[PDB]
Amino acid sequence: AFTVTVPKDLYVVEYGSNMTIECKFPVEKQLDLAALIVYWEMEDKNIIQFVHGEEDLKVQHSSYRQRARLLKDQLSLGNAALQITDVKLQDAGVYRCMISYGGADYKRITVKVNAPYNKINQRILVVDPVTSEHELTCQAEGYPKAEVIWTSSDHQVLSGKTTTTNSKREEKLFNVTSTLRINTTTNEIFYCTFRRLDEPENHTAELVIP
Amino acid sequence: NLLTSYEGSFKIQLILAKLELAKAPSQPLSQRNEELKRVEQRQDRLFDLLDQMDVEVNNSIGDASERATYKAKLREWKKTIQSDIKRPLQSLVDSG
């Protein structure tokens, strides 16, 4: 019988990366490209309509204008692979692949998009050189609401202000900015640690006073 | 050609709807109650595809020798939709 094999039902994809979800179908001897039909859709959105060896770009949804691709080199290997570039939060959901090569079958794949606070921007500005009052600032972008834990090598745990805002570059994910205003010394090492409300493991940046 | 885009879309929707009716009973009751409505969307889409293909058939190249030939294919496909999709769909909404 004709069955479509899915290498993994759950894909956890990091934000900003490329996603390559696979659906495999049996190929015997060779690929009859004329009789092969591949269809990919997410939440009633036409992603890929591949008929007679030719993609149908006119039916493709606007949001998937030049993000989706069908790796045709893998089609001969009995593996229809869907590639999406610049994965965003709206891409999470159930994807449906229907393959008609002789027989026909469809399968579902659940995609979860991870948006960790990986990219950490830092700055150290001097406020009052007399009292060595420095302001340390750490900014990261991610979706699950997060807080910043400021730690030092010597003073150990200190205290800082953390704020939640909407992003300006990308989707509704939040741009968390925390500032620590303390009097420090030269080459005193400070750390800012991003810990969200959810499960993912924390990420820490290092600040060295100039 | 536009009609080829219609042929591809119609064939894909037809196969997908039949498979969704086949896989509905092997699916959670909660998860399936919306899939039965999704099939209704696919069912309405197939009728719109045939009705629009009728416009493009005459507006595209060919003659009456082609006109009658293609519309006979469309009549067979129309009965295919009612026999394989709509009728089995109502035999699933009754259960439960």
Residue numbers in the entry:
A (entry chain A): 18 to 227
B (entry chain C): 4 to 99
From the manuscript:
Here we use a geometric deep-learning framework operating on protein surfaces that generates fingerprints to describe geometric and chemical features that are critical to drive protein–protein interactions. As a proof of principle, we computationally designed several de novo protein binders to engage four protein targets: SARS-CoV-2 spike, PD-1, PD-L1 and CTLA-4. Guided by these general principles of molecular recognition, we introduce a protein design approach based on the critical importance of the fully buried patches of the interface to drive protein interactions. Overall, our surface-centric approach captures the physical and chemical determinants of molecular recognition, enabling an approach for the de novo design of protein interactions and, more broadly, of artificial proteins with function.
To test our fingerprint-based approach, we sought to design binders to target the PD-1–PD-L1 interaction, which is central to the regulation of T cell activity in the immune system. We used MaSIF-site to find high-propensity protein-binding sites in PD-L1 and, unsurprisingly, the identified site overlapped significantly with the native binding site engaged by PD-1. The second lead design, which uses the same seed but is based on a different scaffold, DBL2_01, could not be solubly expressed and we therefore designed a combinatorial library to improve expression and binding affinity. From this library, we isolated the variant DBL2_02, which had six mutations, and expressed it in Escherichia coli. From the six mutations, three were predicted to be in the interface (Y23K, Q35E, Q42R) and improved binding affinity by forming additional salt bridges with PD-L1. The KD to PD-L1 determined by SPR was 374 nM, more than tenfold higher than the native ligand PD-1. To experimentally validate the binding mode, we co-crystallized the designs with PD-L1. Overall, for both designs, the structures showed excellent agreement with our computational models, with RMSDs of 0.8 Å and 2.0 Å for the overall backbone and 1.0 Å and 1.9 Å for the full atom interface for DBL1_03 and DBL2_02, respectively, showing a very high accuracy of the predictions in the interface region. The chemical composition of the designed interface is similar in both designs—around 59% of the surface area is hydrophobic and the remaining area is hydrophilic for DBL1_03 and correspondingly for DBL2_02. Whereas the native PD-1 uses a β-hairpin to engage the site, the designed binders do so through an α-helix motif, illustrating the ability of our approach to explore outside of the structural repertoire of native binding motifs.
